[PDB]
Amino acid sequence: SMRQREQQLLEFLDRLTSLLESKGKVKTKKLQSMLGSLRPAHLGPCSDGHYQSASGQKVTLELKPLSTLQPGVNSGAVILGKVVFSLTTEEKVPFTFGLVDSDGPCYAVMVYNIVQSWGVLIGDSVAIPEPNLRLHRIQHKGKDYSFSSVRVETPLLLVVNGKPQG
Ligand SMILES: [Cl-]
């Protein structure tokens, strides 16, 4: 049997893994036009060369594909993608969305600590400085999930359509 918290969490992972595989059921033509609309300018101030690192220092960031992210904190990198779906759990944590930055696979992004109003729309550009990639391998209650997520500490770190969120 399952209790309520675990049941809705497994439901969420079911939906998330399905949405990642279908890229939010967004049609190929729409995906290509979304991807075509990505601009270097959408990095916003991450581009600047005077981006203030979370550990204190002023560092320069390099745009890299999602597919090249390594587990853990990807120091000195930034990623830039298009939103193809969003969802959350019954507990409204985390705020989760899928990004594509290429013709290859979609990546989940999980955003924590949303205090004020926040969200993103399908078709938005999102830049994530120094992304923290987690490689989930979950086996629980006869279910099995294997997917990556980028853990975002606060929305304030993100750049959306080239506008810093903080
Ligand atoms: Cl949502």
PDB file of C-alpha atoms and ligand atoms in Angstrom:
ATOM      1  CA  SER A   1       0.000   0.000   0.000  1.00  0.00           C
ATOM      2  CA  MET A   2       0.952   3.713  -0.257  1.00  0.00           C
ATOM      3  CA  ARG A   3       0.250   6.612   2.083  1.00  0.00           C
ATOM      4  CA  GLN A   4      -0.896   9.977   0.683  1.00  0.00           C
ATOM      5  CA  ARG A   5       2.348  11.928   0.610  1.00  0.00           C
ATOM      6  CA  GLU A   6       4.280   9.184  -1.186  1.00  0.00           C
ATOM      7  CA  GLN A   7       1.370   8.487  -3.596  1.00  0.00           C
ATOM      8  CA  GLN A   8       1.199  12.076  -4.859  1.00  0.00           C
ATOM      9  CA  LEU A   9       4.977  12.292  -5.048  1.00  0.00           C
ATOM     10  CA  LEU A  10       5.057   9.149  -7.253  1.00  0.00           C
ATOM     11  CA  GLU A  11       2.208  10.627  -9.381  1.00  0.00           C
ATOM     12  CA  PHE A  12       4.348  13.760  -9.884  1.00  0.00           C
ATOM     13  CA  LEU A  13       7.382  11.754 -10.918  1.00  0.00           C
ATOM     14  CA  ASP A  14       5.192   9.735 -13.328  1.00  0.00           C
ATOM     15  CA  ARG A  15       3.952  12.974 -14.931  1.00  0.00           C
ATOM     16  CA  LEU A  16       7.408  14.573 -14.920  1.00  0.00           C
ATOM     17  CA  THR A  17       9.155  11.593 -16.547  1.00  0.00           C
ATOM     18  CA  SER A  18       6.361  11.468 -19.163  1.00  0.00           C
ATOM     19  CA  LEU A  19       6.543  15.218 -19.901  1.00  0.00           C
ATOM     20  CA  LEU A  20      10.374  15.061 -20.195  1.00  0.00           C
ATOM     21  CA  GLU A  21      10.085  12.223 -22.760  1.00  0.00           C
ATOM     22  CA  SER A  22       7.449  14.082 -24.825  1.00  0.00           C
ATOM     23  CA  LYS A  23       9.019  17.614 -24.418  1.00  0.00           C
ATOM     24  CA  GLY A  24       5.672  18.729 -23.040  1.00  0.00           C
ATOM     25  CA  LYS A  25       3.912  17.319 -26.084  1.00  0.00           C
ATOM     26  CA  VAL A  26       5.110  20.449 -27.962  1.00  0.00           C
ATOM     27  CA  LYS A  27       5.048  19.776 -31.781  1.00  0.00           C
ATOM     28  CA  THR A  28       8.390  19.481 -33.664  1.00  0.00           C
ATOM     29  CA  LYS A  29       7.692  22.679 -35.693  1.00  0.00           C
ATOM     30  CA  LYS A  30       7.018  24.632 -32.507  1.00  0.00           C
ATOM     31  CA  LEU A  31      10.134  23.227 -30.809  1.00  0.00           C
ATOM     32  CA  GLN A  32      12.312  24.316 -33.783  1.00  0.00           C
ATOM     33  CA  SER A  33      10.806  27.842 -33.757  1.00  0.00           C
ATOM     34  CA  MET A  34      11.247  28.132 -29.948  1.00  0.00           C
ATOM     35  CA  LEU A  35      14.844  27.004 -30.308  1.00  0.00           C
ATOM     36  CA  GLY A  36      15.383  29.482 -33.205  1.00  0.00           C
ATOM     37  CA  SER A  37      14.248  32.339 -30.951  1.00  0.00           C
ATOM     38  CA  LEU A  38      17.026  31.773 -28.319  1.00  0.00           C
ATOM     39  CA  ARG A  39      19.375  34.788 -28.281  1.00  0.00           C
ATOM     40  CA  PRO A  40      22.791  35.307 -26.584  1.00  0.00           C
ATOM     41  CA  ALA A  41      21.130  38.440 -25.144  1.00  0.00           C
ATOM     42  CA  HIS A  42      18.816  36.200 -23.122  1.00  0.00           C
ATOM     43  CA  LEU A  43      21.783  35.430 -20.792  1.00  0.00           C
ATOM     44  CA  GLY A  44      21.137  38.955 -19.483  1.00  0.00           C
ATOM     45  CA  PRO A  45      23.841  39.974 -16.978  1.00  0.00           C
ATOM     46  CA  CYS A  46      25.378  36.413 -16.829  1.00  0.00           C
ATOM     47  CA  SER A  47      27.145  37.462 -20.031  1.00  0.00           C
ATOM     48  CA  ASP A  48      28.576  40.621 -18.353  1.00  0.00           C
ATOM     49  CA  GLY A  49      31.949  39.234 -17.167  1.00  0.00           C
ATOM     50  CA  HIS A  50      31.209  40.828 -13.763  1.00  0.00           C
ATOM     51  CA  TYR A  51      28.746  38.166 -12.581  1.00  0.00           C
ATOM     52  CA  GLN A  52      29.063  37.884  -8.779  1.00  0.00           C
ATOM     53  CA  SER A  53      29.517  34.214  -7.789  1.00  0.00           C
ATOM     54  CA  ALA A  54      27.440  32.749  -4.933  1.00  0.00           C
ATOM     55  CA  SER A  55      30.665  32.070  -2.950  1.00  0.00           C
ATOM     56  CA  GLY A  56      31.654  35.764  -3.286  1.00  0.00           C
ATOM     57  CA  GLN A  57      34.017  36.235  -6.250  1.00  0.00           C
ATOM     58  CA  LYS A  58      33.490  38.028  -9.585  1.00  0.00           C
ATOM     59  CA  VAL A  59      33.606  35.361 -12.334  1.00  0.00           C
ATOM     60  CA  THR A  60      33.087  35.064 -16.106  1.00  0.00           C
ATOM     61  CA  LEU A  61      30.515  32.428 -17.322  1.00  0.00           C
ATOM     62  CA  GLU A  62      30.555  30.185 -20.450  1.00  0.00           C
ATOM     63  CA  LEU A  63      27.345  29.126 -22.152  1.00  0.00           C
ATOM     64  CA  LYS A  64      27.215  25.331 -22.449  1.00  0.00           C
ATOM     65  CA  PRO A  65      24.520  22.828 -23.514  1.00  0.00           C
ATOM     66  CA  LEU A  66      22.393  21.115 -20.881  1.00  0.00           C
ATOM     67  CA  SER A  67      23.654  17.785 -22.231  1.00  0.00           C
ATOM     68  CA  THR A  68      27.179  18.748 -21.162  1.00  0.00           C
ATOM     69  CA  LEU A  69      26.320  19.461 -17.468  1.00  0.00           C
ATOM     70  CA  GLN A  70      28.227  17.319 -14.913  1.00  0.00           C
ATOM     71  CA  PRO A  71      26.789  16.164 -11.528  1.00  0.00           C
ATOM     72  CA  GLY A  72      26.892  18.827  -8.851  1.00  0.00           C
ATOM     73  CA  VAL A  73      27.565  22.518  -9.222  1.00  0.00           C
ATOM     74  CA  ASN A  74      28.742  23.434 -12.734  1.00  0.00           C
ATOM     75  CA  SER A  75      31.162  26.198 -11.846  1.00  0.00           C
ATOM     76  CA  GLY A  76      31.861  28.728 -14.572  1.00  0.00           C
ATOM     77  CA  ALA A  77      29.024  27.574 -16.856  1.00  0.00           C
ATOM     78  CA  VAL A  78      25.609  28.923 -17.654  1.00  0.00           C
ATOM     79  CA  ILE A  79      22.824  27.216 -19.596  1.00  0.00           C
ATOM     80  CA  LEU A  80      20.085  28.810 -21.719  1.00  0.00           C
ATOM     81  CA  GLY A  81      16.881  26.992 -22.696  1.00  0.00           C
ATOM     82  CA  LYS A  82      13.229  27.242 -23.711  1.00  0.00           C
ATOM     83  CA  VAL A  83      10.420  26.249 -21.333  1.00  0.00           C
ATOM     84  CA  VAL A  84       8.332  23.374 -22.733  1.00  0.00           C
ATOM     85  CA  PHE A  85       6.147  22.519 -19.677  1.00  0.00           C
ATOM     86  CA  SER A  86       5.643  23.270 -15.989  1.00  0.00           C
ATOM     87  CA  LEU A  87       4.107  21.355 -13.064  1.00  0.00           C
ATOM     88  CA  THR A  88       4.275  20.947  -9.307  1.00  0.00           C
ATOM     89  CA  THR A  89       3.280  18.532  -6.587  1.00  0.00           C
ATOM     90  CA  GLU A  90       0.203  18.746  -4.361  1.00  0.00           C
ATOM     91  CA  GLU A  91       2.456  20.470  -1.756  1.00  0.00           C
ATOM     92  CA  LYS A  92       3.377  23.126  -4.365  1.00  0.00           C
ATOM     93  CA  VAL A  93       7.069  22.406  -3.947  1.00  0.00           C
ATOM     94  CA  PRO A  94       9.106  22.431  -6.076  1.00  0.00           C
ATOM     95  CA  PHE A  95       8.058  24.565  -9.062  1.00  0.00           C
ATOM     96  CA  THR A  96       9.198  22.326 -11.917  1.00  0.00           C
ATOM     97  CA  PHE A  97       9.720  23.050 -15.594  1.00  0.00           C
ATOM     98  CA  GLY A  98      11.339  21.464 -18.638  1.00  0.00           C
ATOM     99  CA  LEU A  99      13.991  23.145 -20.753  1.00  0.00           C
ATOM    100  CA  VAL A 100      15.278  22.371 -24.235  1.00  0.00           C
ATOM    101  CA  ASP A 101      18.361  24.070 -25.651  1.00  0.00           C
ATOM    102  CA  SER A 102      18.863  21.690 -28.567  1.00  0.00           C
ATOM    103  CA  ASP A 103      17.220  18.991 -30.678  1.00  0.00           C
ATOM    104  CA  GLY A 104      18.307  16.524 -27.909  1.00  0.00           C
ATOM    105  CA  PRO A 105      16.702  15.702 -24.528  1.00  0.00           C
ATOM    106  CA  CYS A 106      14.650  17.928 -22.214  1.00  0.00           C
ATOM    107  CA  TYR A 107      16.008  18.680 -18.692  1.00  0.00           C
ATOM    108  CA  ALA A 108      13.897  19.183 -15.531  1.00  0.00           C
ATOM    109  CA  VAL A 109      14.476  22.262 -13.397  1.00  0.00           C
ATOM    110  CA  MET A 110      13.206  22.366  -9.794  1.00  0.00           C
ATOM    111  CA  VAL A 111      12.885  25.779  -8.133  1.00  0.00           C
ATOM    112  CA  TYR A 112      12.766  26.102  -4.348  1.00  0.00           C
ATOM    113  CA  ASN A 113      12.116  28.886  -1.853  1.00  0.00           C
ATOM    114  CA  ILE A 114       9.425  30.746  -3.841  1.00  0.00           C
ATOM    115  CA  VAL A 115       8.344  33.337  -1.337  1.00  0.00           C
ATOM    116  CA  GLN A 116       6.769  35.977  -3.573  1.00  0.00           C
ATOM    117  CA  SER A 117       4.820  35.491  -6.809  1.00  0.00           C
ATOM    118  CA  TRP A 118       6.779  33.649  -9.449  1.00  0.00           C
ATOM    119  CA  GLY A 119       6.490  31.418 -12.446  1.00  0.00           C
ATOM    120  CA  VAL A 120       7.494  30.914 -16.042  1.00  0.00           C
ATOM    121  CA  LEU A 121       5.536  30.390 -19.206  1.00  0.00           C
ATOM    122  CA  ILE A 122       5.865  27.858 -21.967  1.00  0.00           C
ATOM    123  CA  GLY A 123       8.107  29.491 -24.587  1.00  0.00           C
ATOM    124  CA  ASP A 124      10.087  31.615 -22.111  1.00  0.00           C
ATOM    125  CA  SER A 125      13.920  31.671 -22.269  1.00  0.00           C
ATOM    126  CA  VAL A 126      15.495  30.709 -18.964  1.00  0.00           C
ATOM    127  CA  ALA A 127      19.192  31.136 -18.105  1.00  0.00           C
ATOM    128  CA  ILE A 128      20.638  29.341 -15.053  1.00  0.00           C
ATOM    129  CA  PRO A 129      24.101  30.371 -13.853  1.00  0.00           C
ATOM    130  CA  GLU A 130      26.347  27.660 -12.395  1.00  0.00           C
ATOM    131  CA  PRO A 131      23.617  25.038 -12.475  1.00  0.00           C
ATOM    132  CA  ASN A 132      23.486  22.371  -9.790  1.00  0.00           C
ATOM    133  CA  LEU A 133      22.695  19.063 -11.510  1.00  0.00           C
ATOM    134  CA  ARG A 134      21.337  16.132  -9.477  1.00  0.00           C
ATOM    135  CA  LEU A 135      21.253  12.594 -11.030  1.00  0.00           C
ATOM    136  CA  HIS A 136      18.190  10.950  -9.491  1.00  0.00           C
ATOM    137  CA  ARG A 137      17.927   7.204  -9.388  1.00  0.00           C
ATOM    138  CA  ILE A 138      14.747   6.505  -7.363  1.00  0.00           C
ATOM    139  CA  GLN A 139      13.399   3.045  -6.586  1.00  0.00           C
ATOM    140  CA  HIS A 140      10.358   3.194  -4.258  1.00  0.00           C
ATOM    141  CA  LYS A 141       7.187   1.025  -3.989  1.00  0.00           C
ATOM    142  CA  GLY A 142       7.854  -1.021  -7.149  1.00  0.00           C
ATOM    143  CA  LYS A 143       8.433   2.199  -9.208  1.00  0.00           C
ATOM    144  CA  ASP A 144      11.756   3.147 -10.830  1.00  0.00           C
ATOM    145  CA  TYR A 145      12.782   6.575 -12.109  1.00  0.00           C
ATOM    146  CA  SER A 146      16.072   7.799 -13.557  1.00  0.00           C
ATOM    147  CA  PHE A 147      16.270  11.467 -14.513  1.00  0.00           C
ATOM    148  CA  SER A 148      18.377  14.560 -13.917  1.00  0.00           C
ATOM    149  CA  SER A 149      17.151  17.753 -12.299  1.00  0.00           C
ATOM    150  CA  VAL A 150      18.763  21.202 -11.947  1.00  0.00           C
ATOM    151  CA  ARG A 151      18.208  22.321  -8.335  1.00  0.00           C
ATOM    152  CA  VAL A 152      17.573  26.089  -8.129  1.00  0.00           C
ATOM    153  CA  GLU A 153      17.905  27.488  -4.576  1.00  0.00           C
ATOM    154  CA  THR A 154      15.705  30.536  -5.257  1.00  0.00           C
ATOM    155  CA  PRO A 155      14.071  32.075  -8.362  1.00  0.00           C
ATOM    156  CA  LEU A 156      16.137  35.202  -7.667  1.00  0.00           C
ATOM    157  CA  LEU A 157      19.130  33.432  -9.355  1.00  0.00           C
ATOM    158  CA  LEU A 158      17.375  32.979 -12.714  1.00  0.00           C
ATOM    159  CA  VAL A 159      17.269  35.117 -15.872  1.00  0.00           C
ATOM    160  CA  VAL A 160      13.985  34.926 -17.783  1.00  0.00           C
ATOM    161  CA  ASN A 161      13.706  36.405 -21.300  1.00  0.00           C
ATOM    162  CA  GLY A 162      16.962  38.181 -20.530  1.00  0.00           C
ATOM    163  CA  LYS A 163      15.636  39.841 -17.358  1.00  0.00           C
ATOM    164  CA  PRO A 164      17.189  38.939 -14.015  1.00  0.00           C
ATOM    165  CA  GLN A 165      14.511  37.677 -11.581  1.00  0.00           C
ATOM    166  CA  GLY A 166      16.286  39.238  -8.600  1.00  0.00           C
TER     167      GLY A 166
HETATM  168 CL    CL B   1       2.736  25.090 -12.826  1.00  0.00          CL
END
